[PDB]
Amino acid sequence: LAGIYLKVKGKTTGEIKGSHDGKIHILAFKNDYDMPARLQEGLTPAAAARGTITLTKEMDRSSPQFLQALGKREMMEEFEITIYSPTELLFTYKFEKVLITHMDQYSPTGYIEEIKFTYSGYSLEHAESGIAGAANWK
Amino acid sequence: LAGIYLKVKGKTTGEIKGSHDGKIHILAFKNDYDMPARLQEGLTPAAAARGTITLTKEMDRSSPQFLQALGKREMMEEFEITIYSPTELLFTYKFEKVLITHMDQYSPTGYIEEIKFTYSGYSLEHAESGIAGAANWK
Amino acid sequence: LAGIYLKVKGKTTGEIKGSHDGKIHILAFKNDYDMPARLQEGLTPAAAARGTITLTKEMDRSSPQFLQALGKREMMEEFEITIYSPTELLFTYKFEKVLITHMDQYSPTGYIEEIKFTYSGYSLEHAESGIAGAANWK
Amino acid sequence: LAGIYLKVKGKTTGEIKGSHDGKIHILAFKNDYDMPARLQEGLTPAAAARGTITLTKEMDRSSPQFLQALGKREMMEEFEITIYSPTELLFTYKFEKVLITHMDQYSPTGYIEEIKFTYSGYSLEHAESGIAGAANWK
Amino acid sequence: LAGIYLKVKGKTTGEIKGSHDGKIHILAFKNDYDMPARLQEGLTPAAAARGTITLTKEMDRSSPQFLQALGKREMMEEFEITIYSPTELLFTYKFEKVLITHMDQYSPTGYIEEIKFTYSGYSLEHAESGIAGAANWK
Amino acid sequence: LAGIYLKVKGKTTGEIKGSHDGKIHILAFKNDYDMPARLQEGLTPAAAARGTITLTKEMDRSSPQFLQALGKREMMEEFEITIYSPTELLFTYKFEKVLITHMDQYSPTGYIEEIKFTYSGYSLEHAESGIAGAANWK
């Protein structure tokens, strides 16, 4: 089925699922990555950069798991986003050193949450072509 | 009946009710929880974090009670939110060390108030599944 | 008649009226009260808090009186808001140490003003039930 | 005729008129007056306060006169706003120590300008009733 | 023909034209002029003030010329805006010591640019009446 | 075909293409260039200035390549934007010392990304006329 799916396992919680077997349906995503134009003398690109990905999802059985990880600073052991479109896989993201840094959960005004994850290493792969990019990986 | 309900008791005021017996009908909620990506050396997660929950409700007989607690820094002894949806219980939140930190009460432009509560320990439980998360609890 | 009414007397000006006899019809109100989560060591709640109430009203014969009080830092000797709804009294607010801190008066774009009052002590009373709250009073 | 009119004379320019004889038709006004809740020890109310009135008007023959006064810091010798409504005079404002502090002139997106005036002394008078207020006057 | 026209010559580039012969059709303008209420002791009005005029225009053959002047800090030798309305000349602006300080060029979302010019001396003249104002001129 | 096209090669990645042969179709662009009015004593125009161009595009096979370059601070060896309109070439931009400084990639709320590039030298050329501008080039 078409759309955005997350495959995630916490370092202490283990596999986090919703109700693409084992994957959580994501309603929307925004990957935001910032690099200053001027690199501080002697500073690594990675330390200068800020990568965050915000996932919007229906509140579900994973919602307690994410909420706990946030407060306990639990790292995600596995974090992979796969995007399907008309049928076929389009994009695969993978992220390393993933920490949850913000959650908002809210009612209608169904129940929705926005979860923001900060990461270090990343990978994006265009499936049809096989072109991939990665930085700060392993 | 479907929707968001609060069960609350003040440490000095005692049980706070409106007109789900003993529970206050809440129109909307937003649970906002922030964790810095970089943890200050020697700082607890809890001290780095900020958890707030904002409740929107019709002004009612509890409105004076909340307004007083706010000005007197009265802690909530009990603070539990239960969310029902089509029929059935979906989610239970519990919060510890609950202090009211902001209120806005206002006319049409019926009478509505937004109440913001800061907390320390929290719990969220997905009812159907029993999956729960908690941090900084007791 | 239904709506929001103010009963106000200045310490030097005396009773301030418009054209609920002696009360000023208010179009809208917003009571905003802020309490920091962390209380500075040795600081009173009252000094940490900020209470303001903003009243929206048609410009009228009281408009010069409020405008003068603002510039002269005249305290309100009496300041009571009463809210009526369908018929019956709903809520009574009373405020102490009331100073006007901001006015905006403006044309259509009838003549309207927004008046912001800062206070110390406050009271809110739910009429039907008699439940009341107050802080920093007398 | 109904609406907002300005009567103004510059200290060096003399009488400033448009095409209520001698008065400039104003499209809109906003009188904004701010008083800090806490008065700095030994500070006059007037020095703590900020009064500004913003007038919106069609660009006209007075537009060069206001634009020049702004750049030359020319004080207004006379500055009176009169407001007429259905027929009859409603309100009279008078301002002292009037300096122009901001102009924006702009095309359709007819030709319009917003002019912001800072003042010290002020007066507002409700015509029908004769109730007046003033502060920091002469 | 009605509207806003610019006559401009760069100090090094010479005359800058588009496709009112020799004048560039401007879609919109905003002249923004700021004067602080308090003049720093010993500071000229001109140094305290900030005058900027923002011109919105279709991208055209002048677009490279303005873009270059911006990066090279080239002063405009001539800068005159004339505004025609129903037929007849309404207003003439002239500006001295004109430097381009910001450009945004952008696609539909035809090709449009917003160009912001900072100036020192200025003049505005109401044509029908001949009333003029100027400050900081020559 | 009409619209905005990018021709780009990374210094390490080589040619970056999508699915105007070899050019990437761009949905929208915004070239933003800022020059302070006051040039710091002894500072070059280039160091005072900030030039950025933001490109909006469908996520595609180039998306991994741009995302990697961003994190690795890879400079673009070639960066040329060409704009076609009704049929014919309108504008050519060229940029030097191009670094990617920000990306946002996001879902519908197809898959879209906004990519912000900072540059030093630039050129813009109006094709029909041949008028060109450039600063800080080679």
Side-chain angles (χ1 to χ4, degrees), chain A residues 1-20 22-49 51-87 89-108 110-127 129-138, chain B residues 1-20 22-49 51-87 89-108 110-127 129-138, chain C residues 1-20 22-49 51-87 89-108 110-127 129-138, chain D residues 1-20 22-49 51-87 89-108 110-127 129-138, chain E residues 1-20 22-49 51-87 89-108 110-127 129-138, chain F residues 1-20 22-49 51-87 89-108 110-127 129-138:
Chain A
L1 189 63
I4 308 150
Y5 296 88
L6 177 66
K7 174 101 298 187
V8 52
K9 186 176 198 306
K11 286 193 191 171
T12 68
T13 297
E15 207 199 322
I16 298 174
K17 321 170 280 151
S19 53
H20 298 307
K23 294 185 181 172
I24 307 182
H25 184 218
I26 298 307
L27 297 167
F29 82 93
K30 179 190 166 181
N31 182 45
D32 177 275
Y33 195 100
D34 182 76
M35 177 62 76
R38 190 195 109 65
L39 186 55
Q40 171 183 344
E41 190 172 346
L43 189 62
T44 67
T52 64
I53 184 162
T54 302
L55 305 183
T56 298
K57 57 178 287 293
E58 200 175 25
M59 287 187 67
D60 70 356
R61 55 198 72 206
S62 62
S63 299
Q65 290 170 310
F66 289 123
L67 198 67
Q68 177 172 302
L70 170 56
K72 290 201 179 298
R73 301 182 65 82
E74 180 194 350
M75 302 195 38
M76 305 293 100
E77 197 160 60
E78 180 163 13
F79 199 88
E80 164 205 293
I81 297 272
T82 43
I83 300 163
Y84 301 85
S85 59
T87 294
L89 182 72
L90 191 61
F91 287 113
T92 302
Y93 288 88
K94 306 173 189 182
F95 298 101
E96 289 180 339
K97 298 183 173 184
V98 179
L99 188 77
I100 312 177
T101 52
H102 202 90
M103 284 178 69
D104 285 289
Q105 304 178 308
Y106 45 94
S107 60
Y111 297 95
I112 305 296
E113 64 194 351
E114 296 184 350
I115 310 179
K116 191 164 184 185
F117 302 87
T118 299
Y119 56 80
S120 296
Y122 64 85
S123 178
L124 178 61
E125 160 78 287
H126 184 258
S129 74
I131 297 178
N136 310 317
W137 189 264
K138 294 169 94 296
Chain B
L1 189 63
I4 308 150
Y5 296 88
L6 177 66
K7 174 101 298 187
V8 52
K9 186 176 198 306
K11 286 193 191 171
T12 68
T13 297
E15 207 199 322
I16 298 174
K17 321 170 280 151
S19 53
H20 298 307
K23 294 185 181 172
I24 307 182
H25 184 218
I26 298 307
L27 297 167
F29 82 93
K30 179 190 166 181
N31 182 45
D32 177 275
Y33 195 100
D34 182 76
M35 177 62 76
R38 190 195 109 65
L39 186 55
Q40 171 183 344
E41 190 172 346
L43 189 62
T44 67
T52 64
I53 184 162
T54 302
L55 305 183
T56 298
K57 57 178 287 293
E58 200 175 25
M59 287 187 67
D60 70 356
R61 55 198 72 206
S62 62
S63 299
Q65 290 170 310
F66 289 123
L67 198 67
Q68 177 172 302
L70 170 56
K72 290 201 179 298
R73 301 182 65 82
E74 180 194 350
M75 302 195 38
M76 305 293 100
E77 197 160 60
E78 180 163 13
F79 199 88
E80 164 205 293
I81 297 272
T82 43
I83 300 163
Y84 301 85
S85 59
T87 294
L89 182 72
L90 191 61
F91 287 113
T92 302
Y93 288 88
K94 306 173 189 182
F95 298 101
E96 289 180 339
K97 298 183 173 184
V98 179
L99 188 77
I100 312 177
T101 52
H102 202 90
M103 284 178 69
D104 285 289
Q105 304 178 308
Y106 45 94
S107 60
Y111 297 95
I112 305 296
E113 64 194 351
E114 296 184 350
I115 310 179
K116 191 164 184 185
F117 302 87
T118 299
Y119 56 80
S120 296
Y122 64 85
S123 178
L124 178 61
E125 160 78 287
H126 184 258
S129 74
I131 297 178
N136 310 317
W137 189 264
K138 294 169 94 296
Chain C
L1 189 63
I4 308 150
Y5 296 88
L6 177 66
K7 174 101 298 187
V8 52
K9 186 176 198 306
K11 286 193 191 171
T12 68
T13 297
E15 207 199 322
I16 298 174
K17 321 170 280 151
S19 53
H20 298 307
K23 294 185 181 172
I24 307 182
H25 184 218
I26 298 307
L27 297 167
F29 82 93
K30 179 190 166 181
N31 182 45
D32 177 275
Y33 195 100
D34 182 76
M35 177 62 76
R38 190 195 109 65
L39 186 55
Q40 171 183 344
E41 190 172 346
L43 189 62
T44 67
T52 64
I53 184 162
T54 302
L55 305 183
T56 298
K57 57 178 287 293
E58 200 175 25
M59 287 187 67
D60 70 356
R61 55 198 72 206
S62 62
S63 299
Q65 290 170 310
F66 289 123
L67 198 67
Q68 177 172 302
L70 170 56
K72 290 201 179 298
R73 301 182 65 82
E74 180 194 350
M75 302 195 38
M76 305 293 100
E77 197 160 60
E78 180 163 13
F79 199 88
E80 164 205 293
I81 297 272
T82 43
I83 300 163
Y84 301 85
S85 59
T87 294
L89 182 72
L90 191 61
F91 287 113
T92 302
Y93 288 88
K94 306 173 189 182
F95 298 101
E96 289 180 339
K97 298 183 173 184
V98 179
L99 188 77
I100 312 177
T101 52
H102 202 90
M103 284 178 69
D104 285 289
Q105 304 178 308
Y106 45 94
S107 60
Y111 297 95
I112 305 296
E113 64 194 351
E114 296 184 350
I115 310 179
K116 191 164 184 185
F117 302 87
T118 299
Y119 56 80
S120 296
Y122 64 85
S123 178
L124 178 61
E125 160 78 287
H126 184 258
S129 74
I131 297 178
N136 310 317
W137 189 264
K138 294 169 94 296
Chain D
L1 189 63
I4 308 150
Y5 296 88
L6 177 66
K7 174 101 298 187
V8 52
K9 186 176 198 306
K11 286 193 191 171
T12 68
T13 297
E15 207 199 322
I16 298 174
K17 321 170 280 151
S19 53
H20 298 307
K23 294 185 181 172
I24 307 182
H25 184 218
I26 298 307
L27 297 167
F29 82 93
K30 179 190 166 181
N31 182 45
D32 177 275
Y33 195 100
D34 182 76
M35 177 62 76
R38 190 195 109 65
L39 186 55
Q40 171 183 344
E41 190 172 346
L43 189 62
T44 67
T52 64
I53 184 162
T54 302
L55 305 183
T56 298
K57 57 178 287 293
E58 200 175 25
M59 287 187 67
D60 70 356
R61 55 198 72 206
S62 62
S63 299
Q65 290 170 310
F66 289 123
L67 198 67
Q68 177 172 302
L70 170 56
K72 290 201 179 298
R73 301 182 65 82
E74 180 194 350
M75 302 195 38
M76 305 293 100
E77 197 160 60
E78 180 163 13
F79 199 88
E80 164 205 293
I81 297 272
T82 43
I83 300 163
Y84 301 85
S85 59
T87 294
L89 182 72
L90 191 61
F91 287 113
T92 302
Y93 288 88
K94 306 173 189 182
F95 298 101
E96 289 180 339
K97 298 183 173 184
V98 179
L99 188 77
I100 312 177
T101 52
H102 202 90
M103 284 178 69
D104 285 289
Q105 304 178 308
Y106 45 94
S107 60
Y111 297 95
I112 305 296
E113 64 194 351
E114 296 184 350
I115 310 179
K116 191 164 184 185
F117 302 87
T118 299
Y119 56 80
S120 296
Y122 64 85
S123 178
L124 178 61
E125 160 78 287
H126 184 258
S129 74
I131 297 178
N136 310 317
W137 189 264
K138 294 169 94 296
Chain E
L1 189 63
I4 308 150
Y5 296 88
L6 177 66
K7 174 101 298 187
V8 52
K9 186 176 198 306
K11 286 193 191 171
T12 68
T13 297
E15 207 199 322
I16 298 174
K17 321 170 280 151
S19 53
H20 298 307
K23 294 185 181 172
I24 307 182
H25 184 218
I26 298 307
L27 297 167
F29 82 93
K30 179 190 166 181
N31 182 45
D32 177 275
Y33 195 100
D34 182 76
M35 177 62 76
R38 190 195 109 65
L39 186 55
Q40 171 183 344
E41 190 172 346
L43 189 62
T44 67
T52 64
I53 184 162
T54 302
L55 305 183
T56 298
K57 57 178 287 293
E58 200 175 25
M59 287 187 67
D60 70 356
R61 55 198 72 206
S62 62
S63 299
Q65 290 170 310
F66 289 123
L67 198 67
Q68 177 172 302
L70 170 56
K72 290 201 179 298
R73 301 182 65 82
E74 180 194 350
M75 302 195 38
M76 305 293 100
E77 197 160 60
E78 180 163 13
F79 199 88
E80 164 205 293
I81 297 272
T82 43
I83 300 163
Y84 301 85
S85 59
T87 294
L89 182 72
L90 191 61
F91 287 113
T92 302
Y93 288 88
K94 306 173 189 182
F95 298 101
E96 289 180 339
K97 298 183 173 184
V98 179
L99 188 77
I100 312 177
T101 52
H102 202 90
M103 284 178 69
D104 285 289
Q105 304 178 308
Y106 45 94
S107 60
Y111 297 95
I112 305 296
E113 64 194 351
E114 296 184 350
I115 310 179
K116 191 164 184 185
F117 302 87
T118 299
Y119 56 80
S120 296
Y122 64 85
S123 178
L124 178 61
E125 160 78 287
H126 184 258
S129 74
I131 297 178
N136 310 317
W137 189 264
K138 294 169 94 296
Chain F
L1 189 63
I4 308 150
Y5 296 88
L6 177 66
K7 174 101 298 187
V8 52
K9 186 176 198 306
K11 286 193 191 171
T12 68
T13 297
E15 207 199 322
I16 298 174
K17 321 170 280 151
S19 53
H20 298 307
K23 294 185 181 172
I24 307 182
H25 184 218
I26 298 307
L27 297 167
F29 82 93
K30 179 190 166 181
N31 182 45
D32 177 275
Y33 195 100
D34 182 76
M35 177 62 76
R38 190 195 109 65
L39 186 55
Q40 171 183 344
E41 190 172 346
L43 189 62
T44 67
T52 64
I53 184 162
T54 302
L55 305 183
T56 298
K57 57 178 287 293
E58 200 175 25
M59 287 187 67
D60 70 356
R61 55 198 72 206
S62 62
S63 299
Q65 290 170 310
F66 289 123
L67 198 67
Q68 177 172 302
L70 170 56
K72 290 201 179 298
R73 301 182 65 82
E74 180 194 350
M75 302 195 38
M76 305 293 100
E77 197 160 60
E78 180 163 13
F79 199 88
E80 164 205 293
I81 297 272
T82 43
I83 300 163
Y84 301 85
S85 59
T87 294
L89 182 72
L90 191 61
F91 287 113
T92 302
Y93 288 88
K94 306 173 189 182
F95 298 101
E96 289 180 339
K97 298 183 173 184
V98 179
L99 188 77
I100 312 177
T101 52
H102 202 90
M103 284 178 69
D104 285 289
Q105 304 178 308
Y106 45 94
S107 60
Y111 297 95
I112 305 296
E113 64 194 351
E114 296 184 350
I115 310 179
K116 191 164 184 185
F117 302 87
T118 299
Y119 56 80
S120 296
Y122 64 85
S123 178
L124 178 61
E125 160 78 287
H126 184 258
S129 74
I131 297 178
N136 310 317
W137 189 264
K138 294 169 94 296

